[PDB]
Scaffold this motif. Sequence first.
Motif, PDB file in Angstrom:
ATOM      1  N   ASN A 924      -7.573  -6.765 -30.859  1.00 18.30           N
ATOM      2  CA  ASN A 924      -6.796  -6.524 -29.615  1.00 18.30           C
ATOM      3  C   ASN A 924      -6.545  -5.017 -29.515  1.00 18.30           C
ATOM      4  O   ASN A 924      -6.702  -4.466 -28.408  1.00 18.30           O
ATOM      5  CB  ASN A 924      -5.487  -7.315 -29.585  1.00 18.30           C
ATOM      6  CG  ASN A 924      -5.666  -8.744 -29.120  1.00 18.30           C
ATOM      7  OD1 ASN A 924      -6.150  -8.986 -28.016  1.00 18.30           O
ATOM      8  ND2 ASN A 924      -5.280  -9.697 -29.952  1.00 18.30           N
ATOM      9  N   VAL A 925      -6.181  -4.379 -30.633  1.00 15.80           N
ATOM     10  CA  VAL A 925      -5.976  -2.932 -30.646  1.00 15.80           C
ATOM     11  C   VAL A 925      -7.272  -2.210 -30.301  1.00 15.80           C
ATOM     12  O   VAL A 925      -7.283  -1.263 -29.503  1.00 15.80           O
ATOM     13  CB  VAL A 925      -5.425  -2.487 -32.013  1.00 15.80           C
ATOM     14  CG1 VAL A 925      -5.610  -0.991 -32.204  1.00 15.80           C
ATOM     15  CG2 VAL A 925      -3.965  -2.870 -32.142  1.00 15.80           C
ATOM     16  N   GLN A1063       0.481  -3.634 -24.220  1.00 14.79           N
ATOM     17  CA  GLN A1063       0.405  -4.678 -25.247  1.00 14.79           C
ATOM     18  C   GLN A1063      -0.026  -4.145 -26.619  1.00 14.79           C
ATOM     19  O   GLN A1063       0.346  -4.725 -27.659  1.00 14.79           O
ATOM     20  CB  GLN A1063      -0.524  -5.804 -24.791  1.00 14.79           C
ATOM     21  CG  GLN A1063      -1.956  -5.393 -24.537  1.00 14.79           C
ATOM     22  CD  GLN A1063      -2.870  -6.589 -24.388  1.00 14.79           C
ATOM     23  OE1 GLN A1063      -3.935  -6.654 -25.000  1.00 14.79           O
ATOM     24  NE2 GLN A1063      -2.454  -7.552 -23.575  1.00 14.79           N
ATOM     25  N   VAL A1064      -0.784  -3.044 -26.660  1.00 15.07           N
ATOM     26  CA  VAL A1064      -1.173  -2.486 -27.953  1.00 15.07           C
ATOM     27  C   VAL A1064       0.056  -2.060 -28.744  1.00 15.07           C
ATOM     28  O   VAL A1064      -0.006  -1.950 -29.974  1.00 15.07           O
ATOM     29  CB  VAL A1064      -2.161  -1.309 -27.778  1.00 15.07           C
ATOM     30  CG1 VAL A1064      -1.448  -0.065 -27.291  1.00 15.07           C
ATOM     31  CG2 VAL A1064      -2.903  -1.032 -29.076  1.00 15.07           C
ATOM     32  N   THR A1065       1.179  -1.838 -28.057  1.00 14.95           N
ATOM     33  CA  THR A1065       2.456  -1.574 -28.712  1.00 14.95           C
ATOM     34  C   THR A1065       2.732  -2.587 -29.821  1.00 14.95           C
ATOM     35  O   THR A1065       2.743  -2.240 -31.006  1.00 14.95           O
ATOM     36  CB  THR A1065       3.562  -1.583 -27.647  1.00 14.95           C
ATOM     37  OG1 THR A1065       3.485  -0.385 -26.865  1.00 14.95           O
ATOM     38  CG2 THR A1065       4.944  -1.692 -28.256  1.00 14.95           C
ATOM     39  N   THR A1066       2.884  -3.857 -29.437  1.00 14.15           N
ATOM     40  CA  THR A1066       3.162  -4.922 -30.436  1.00 14.15           C
ATOM     41  C   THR A1066       1.910  -5.194 -31.275  1.00 14.15           C
ATOM     42  O   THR A1066       2.070  -5.596 -32.445  1.00 14.15           O
ATOM     43  CB  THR A1066       3.641  -6.204 -29.746  1.00 14.15           C
ATOM     44  OG1 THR A1066       2.582  -6.670 -28.910  1.00 14.15           O
ATOM     45  CG2 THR A1066       4.894  -5.997 -28.925  1.00 14.15           C
ATOM     46  N   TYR A1067       0.717  -4.981 -30.710  1.00 16.19           N
ATOM     47  CA  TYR A1067      -0.505  -5.316 -31.434  1.00 16.19           C
ATOM     48  C   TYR A1067      -0.685  -4.451 -32.679  1.00 16.19           C
ATOM     49  O   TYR A1067      -1.118  -4.947 -33.722  1.00 16.19           O
ATOM     50  CB  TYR A1067      -1.706  -5.202 -30.504  1.00 16.19           C
ATOM     51  CG  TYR A1067      -1.865  -6.422 -29.637  1.00 16.19           C
ATOM     52  CD1 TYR A1067      -1.452  -7.667 -30.087  1.00 16.19           C
ATOM     53  CD2 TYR A1067      -2.414  -6.331 -28.371  1.00 16.19           C
ATOM     54  CE1 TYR A1067      -1.587  -8.788 -29.303  1.00 16.19           C
ATOM     55  CE2 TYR A1067      -2.556  -7.447 -27.582  1.00 16.19           C
ATOM     56  CZ  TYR A1067      -2.140  -8.671 -28.049  1.00 16.19           C
ATOM     57  OH  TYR A1067      -2.287  -9.782 -27.258  1.00 16.19           O
ATOM     58  N   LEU A1068      -0.358  -3.159 -32.595  1.00 11.85           N
ATOM     59  CA  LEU A1068      -0.519  -2.274 -33.750  1.00 11.85           C
ATOM     60  C   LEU A1068       0.409  -2.665 -34.897  1.00 11.85           C
ATOM     61  O   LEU A1068      -0.005  -2.691 -36.069  1.00 11.85           O
ATOM     62  CB  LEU A1068      -0.270  -0.827 -33.326  1.00 11.85           C
ATOM     63  CG  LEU A1068      -1.092   0.268 -34.005  1.00 11.85           C
ATOM     64  CD1 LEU A1068      -2.539  -0.159 -34.155  1.00 11.85           C
ATOM     65  CD2 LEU A1068      -0.997   1.558 -33.211  1.00 11.85           C
ATOM     66  N   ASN A1069       1.673  -2.957 -34.579  1.00 11.03           N
ATOM     67  CA  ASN A1069       2.623  -3.367 -35.605  1.00 11.03           C
ATOM     68  C   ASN A1069       2.159  -4.642 -36.288  1.00 11.03           C
ATOM     69  O   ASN A1069       2.171  -4.743 -37.524  1.00 11.03           O
ATOM     70  CB  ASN A1069       4.007  -3.565 -34.987  1.00 11.03           C
ATOM     71  CG  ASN A1069       5.056  -3.943 -36.011  1.00 11.03           C
ATOM     72  OD1 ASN A1069       4.880  -3.728 -37.210  1.00 11.03           O
ATOM     73  ND2 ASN A1069       6.156  -4.518 -35.543  1.00 11.03           N
ATOM     74  N   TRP A1070       1.735  -5.619 -35.484  1.00 10.02           N
ATOM     75  CA  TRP A1070       1.262  -6.906 -36.056  1.00 10.02           C
ATOM     76  C   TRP A1070      -0.037  -6.669 -36.832  1.00 10.02           C
ATOM     77  O   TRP A1070      -0.291  -7.415 -37.798  1.00 10.02           O
ATOM     78  CB  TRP A1070       1.094  -7.956 -34.954  1.00 10.02           C
ATOM     79  CG  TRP A1070       1.416  -9.343 -35.415  1.00 10.02           C
ATOM     80  CD1 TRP A1070       0.615 -10.444 -35.340  1.00 10.02           C
ATOM     81  CD2 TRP A1070       2.631  -9.770 -36.058  1.00 10.02           C
ATOM     82  NE1 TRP A1070       1.253 -11.531 -35.874  1.00 10.02           N
ATOM     83  CE2 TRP A1070       2.490 -11.149 -36.325  1.00 10.02           C
ATOM     84  CE3 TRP A1070       3.820  -9.132 -36.424  1.00 10.02           C
ATOM     85  CZ2 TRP A1070       3.495 -11.892 -36.941  1.00 10.02           C
ATOM     86  CZ3 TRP A1070       4.811  -9.867 -37.035  1.00 10.02           C
ATOM     87  CH2 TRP A1070       4.649 -11.229 -37.289  1.00 10.02           C
ATOM     88  N   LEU A1071      -0.822  -5.671 -36.421  1.00 12.65           N
ATOM     89  CA  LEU A1071      -2.089  -5.343 -37.125  1.00 12.65           C
ATOM     90  C   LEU A1071      -1.761  -4.944 -38.566  1.00 12.65           C
ATOM     91  O   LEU A1071      -2.311  -5.572 -39.491  1.00 12.65           O
ATOM     92  CB  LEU A1071      -2.767  -4.188 -36.380  1.00 12.65           C
ATOM     93  CG  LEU A1071      -4.285  -4.073 -36.513  1.00 12.65           C
ATOM     94  CD1 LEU A1071      -4.793  -2.857 -35.756  1.00 12.65           C
ATOM     95  CD2 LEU A1071      -4.719  -3.997 -37.968  1.00 12.65           C
ATOM     96  N   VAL A1072      -0.894  -3.945 -38.758  1.00 11.82           N
ATOM     97  CA  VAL A1072      -0.605  -3.449 -40.139  1.00 11.82           C
ATOM     98  C   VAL A1072       0.159  -4.527 -40.920  1.00 11.82           C
ATOM     99  O   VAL A1072      -0.202  -4.772 -42.088  1.00 11.82           O
ATOM    100  CB  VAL A1072       0.158  -2.110 -40.116  1.00 11.82           C
ATOM    101  CG1 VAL A1072       0.552  -1.666 -41.516  1.00 11.82           C
ATOM    102  CG2 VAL A1072      -0.651  -1.025 -39.424  1.00 11.82           C
TER     103      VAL A1072
END
Length: 1329
Positions: A924-925, A1063-1072
């Motif tokens: 998604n990111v 949406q990449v806002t929440t996506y990056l946090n969930w990524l790491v």
Amino acid sequence: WEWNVTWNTSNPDFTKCFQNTVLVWVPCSYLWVCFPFYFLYLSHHDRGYIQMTHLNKAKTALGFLLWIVCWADLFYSFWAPVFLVSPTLLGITMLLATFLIQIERRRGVQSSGIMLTFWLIALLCALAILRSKIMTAVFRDVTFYIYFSLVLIQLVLSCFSDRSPNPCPESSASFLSRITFWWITGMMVQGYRQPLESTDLWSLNKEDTSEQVVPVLVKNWKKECAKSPSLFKVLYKTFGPYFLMSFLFKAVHDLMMFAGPEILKLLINFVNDKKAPEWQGYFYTALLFISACLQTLVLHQYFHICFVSGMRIKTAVIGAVYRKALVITNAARKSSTVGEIVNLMSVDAQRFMDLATYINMIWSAPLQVILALYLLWLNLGPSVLAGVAVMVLMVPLNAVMAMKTKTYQVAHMKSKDNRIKLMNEILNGIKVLKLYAWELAFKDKVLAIRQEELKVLKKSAYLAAVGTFTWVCTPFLVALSTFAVYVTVDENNILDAQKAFVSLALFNILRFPLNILPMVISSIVQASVSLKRLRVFLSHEDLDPDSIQRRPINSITVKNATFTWARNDPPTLHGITFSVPEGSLVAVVGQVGCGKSSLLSALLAEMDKVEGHVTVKGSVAYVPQQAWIQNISLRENILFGRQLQERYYKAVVEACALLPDLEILPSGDRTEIGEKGVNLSGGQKQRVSLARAVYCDSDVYLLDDPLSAVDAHVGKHIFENVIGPKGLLKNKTRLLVTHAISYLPQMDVIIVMSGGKISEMGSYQELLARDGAFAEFLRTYVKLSVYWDYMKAIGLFISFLSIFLFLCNHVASLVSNYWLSLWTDDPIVNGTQEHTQVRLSVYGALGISQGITVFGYSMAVSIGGIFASRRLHLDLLHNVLRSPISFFERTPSGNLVNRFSKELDTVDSMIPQVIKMFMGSLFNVIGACIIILLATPMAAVIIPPLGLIYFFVQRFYVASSRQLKRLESVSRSPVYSHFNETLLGVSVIRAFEEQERFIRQSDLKVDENQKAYYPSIVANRWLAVRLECVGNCIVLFASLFAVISRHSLSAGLVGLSVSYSLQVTTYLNWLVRMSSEMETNIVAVERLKEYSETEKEAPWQIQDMAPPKDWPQVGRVEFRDYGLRYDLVLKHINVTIDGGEKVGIVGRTGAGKSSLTLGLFRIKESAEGEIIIDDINIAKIGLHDLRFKITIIPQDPVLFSGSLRMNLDPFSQYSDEEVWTSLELAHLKGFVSALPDKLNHECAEGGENLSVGQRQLVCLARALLRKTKILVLDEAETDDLIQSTIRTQFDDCTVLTIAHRLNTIMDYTRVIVLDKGEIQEWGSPSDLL
Ligand SMILES: C[C@]12CC[C@H]3c4ccc(OS(=O)(=O)O)cc4CC[C@@H]3[C@@H]1CCC2=O
Ligand SMILES: N[C@@H](CCC(=O)N[C@@H](CS)C(=O)NCC(=O)O)C(=O)O
């Protein structure tokens, strides 16, 4: 205020009246509404007063000068109506500001959030007026310049932290540091260089330690019970006030995130509209960046509040459960399974902490839906109703599915507990299993329940596939329904970027609250029943200490006392009266079930006293019948917290005859005794218990049968040196429950009873002379290689199919959004778009492919996980069973169990979900970045620096969090492990009056767990903020580069890029987050294959040199120069046992007697030797073959859980008639016919229900049913029976016998004596003497 100068002109200037009214009312107003509220916090929370420092004064002096300057304006005005009220109002709010820093000094606050945000707002307002006043150009302007400079210096000063009035830096952390969570960055650095240990972990906050939280809940629950009882009342009365702020934070966060799509609407309008001022887009992107940053900070403060509150709830619940366990009545304690009481802190406490962080969702998920719906109603109209229909067709289903998930979860724990215990039975008893060669069956037995597990895990996998489909596709499903309806019901329904992409953004904002709402409700309902269980434990009856009058220093006084084990059950001790004087030896005498142990329980206030008066005087030392051993070292078991006195300890240890036990034990008295450490015999446990009581040096001793398991000589020695009048306790009032007459004449007073009633107590000689009840009594008798290995375990085809489907999903989503951007670029014609059915058809086809592909992707990897768990469990079981018993003895059972438990769970229930979530977030990111790059290529320059900023944040957190997630898991088990210990020995805890010590130890254990849990959640909130700002500045940058190139980009492209940036806002946090979880959970897959390459046993079946069916033709054993190691225990062994000749092996401890059997069953390999049975070598034969053709009756038989028939024959190879005949020949027909289940009697773990004699006869029945010519016996009441049975029909077979008793070996001819491995004597016992 007119749009002539504030909007139309390229110079966005505020009007003069607006400057002097609203820009001054904003900051002054902020302090006025906050001031009153702030006294609540300043008053309720205090930390002393800060000293007189230059900084504090500097701030106060500037506050005085600022007020003057603002009132100097009023003076000049006195020398327009707004020229009076505004300066006075500003001066008054300024006087409130300086008073506030003064009182904040008084109340001890180093960093002031209010005095930072207030100055920031004032600064921004001053900046706006400043720019206006410098663009206008002496009289009143210079006053404003002085005001602005002073405000700026005040704001800079307010950032520094004042002086204080391995502690957690949070207390001294600045607000700037308490919103960015910068104070944990040091650990993030430190965890990268030096791996973390418990000492580095910061100490708990004083308001967070168990010593403070638990008494609050205990006191509040006491008050609530005294009022009436509801645990929820106390729960939201104690933790409610701190949890309140999470509401304001969540509401503000919801408003801020909804502000995002509004700014996207304004930006789309700006881009879509030419001839517009260029500064409008820059203002919009700056506002979007500010809103995103504020939402990040508020949201993460909200979660910090939720996570701290949940941790406090867990700590208080655990402490309250521990404290109530020590006060609960026996009746109640037994009503709740011990394991249930451990679960109260194991799950109920956890479930509360886990749920707390989301209780606010019950109120904010609907809000983020209702407000989004209103927003959607502003864009689409009635068509949004269709979207609602989709929610009505989704949210309920998920909820039902969610509940079903929990059901399956329970069933999972049904099978998990069904296997781990069985695995324990396998792990405790590997010696007997290898010898009985049932390794392959139990493999299948164990494998059977795994298959049953997968039957439940595959159902949970179907549910989880439905859940990812209903989560990731939820925004599109709603968007597709609402867009189709919107474009179909009306022909004039234009679809512009403004009315699509903004709505699309809303759908991304309605993805979270929509699907977490069901889960949370599920997590509520489950928590509900947990809560009830807790209430059940917290409403149980208490044991009044007033029951036994504990007078400090006629020693024990009981008059007309009747006691019960329960309120409604009949009395167990009826009308007991006796007076035990100080320093007297009293023996309780009776038959089984008489009420002897009940007397000692009653003297300890363990029985329920229905009537009477008990006046035990002085400290009481209790030696219970069932010995309670702490898992601490033997020295600390005897010490029991008391200071060490070398002379007294060394006088106690041998007086209990514990010196031989100390000698045999490896480390001496420092050995780790208990269930987890080295196991001890019952007699040794009774000694330890007696030694602990004797060291405790009480005046009254209650010895509930201390000499039951010690031998007669050891018992007499103990009584001589400890309990006797010439022992250690000569002046101590000793009570001894006994059924042995040997020491009775030495007793001062004999209390003989019958049926729980005092029956002619007295001294031994007087009682004998009386010739009554006492005479009757006497007459009675991490590298990627592990990721590749897990990929192989899943199955390469399944993994590649999952990758292909995931790529298809993300390509479909990106292409559908690009198609929407193209569709919104269709030029309006006469009030419509030519391509509406075609565009919508393509959009729907793309999204249907996306949804079915999501379902396939989730299902495929879920099935792969199932397959990987199956294969990994099969490999682990096969490798463990193939490993020799040297490995079994070397490795602790703890890690072997951990291979199967709490680690297979991560592989089968966590890794597939975590890998799905990781891959989803990562791609998604990537897709958002690709879309932004495609829209604005100039944003490529943004990628390196932020990427660098990402990389370090990616590098620092993952390195540290792993350690934090290990240390926490390290300290979670002891908390329960202590509690179990506490639960087992509650009577011992109360008798020694050491409740406070164990309460403090439990508090220390819980604080140790929290000292790792708190850094973990703060690490999550630090990583979150760091990644958000990166996803926030890219939103500003994507928007900024869209505004820069607005002449070439259409509105749809701008909206698409901005929404993906949102949406990449929440996506990056969930990524790491999921990236760190990958390493933490894939370490488990690494450790599962930790035995795949270790040395294994010789092949069980060779099949090239297999023996004939009748391999032991006569049973001729020949040890030809045998030498067994593990320097050589066995050496120079050249002996020949003829077929059908009884032969025994005699020797002292340290000889090779037992190791000789280890030579017969090839349990270990021959260092130098050629053992041959008949004409066949053993080393050439496969293990199973020989282990099947030779039988062994070991020292302690192991009765595995299951039916008796599965014990005698799991292979069910022998017919029922053979089993019946063997059981009859084993003197067991009478007993085995007595069980209602016939041969299917369900024996518990180790055959606890069966007696030791029975278990021995069952092992003999196994050996007899085997029908083999070579049999080995290992000898230690029923001895007469087992000896006769081995002498009855096994005369045809060759029997080796290793007995520690010479009486039995004398019967067997050809005795072999082993001195130190050598054959000392080889001949018949007649030649021996
Ligand atoms: C609700 C949740 C937050 C994040 C959620 C998520 C986020 C992205 C996602 O897929 S993604 O493709 O959008 O990355 C799936 C999911 C599935 C559920 C998952 C969590 C369960 C409990 C929790 O706290
Ligand atoms: N949109 C979310 C953003 C907050 C968030 O982080 N969402 C999930 C994760 S996607 C969560 O609650 N995580 C908590 C955590 O970081 O532990 C909201 O409104 O709460």
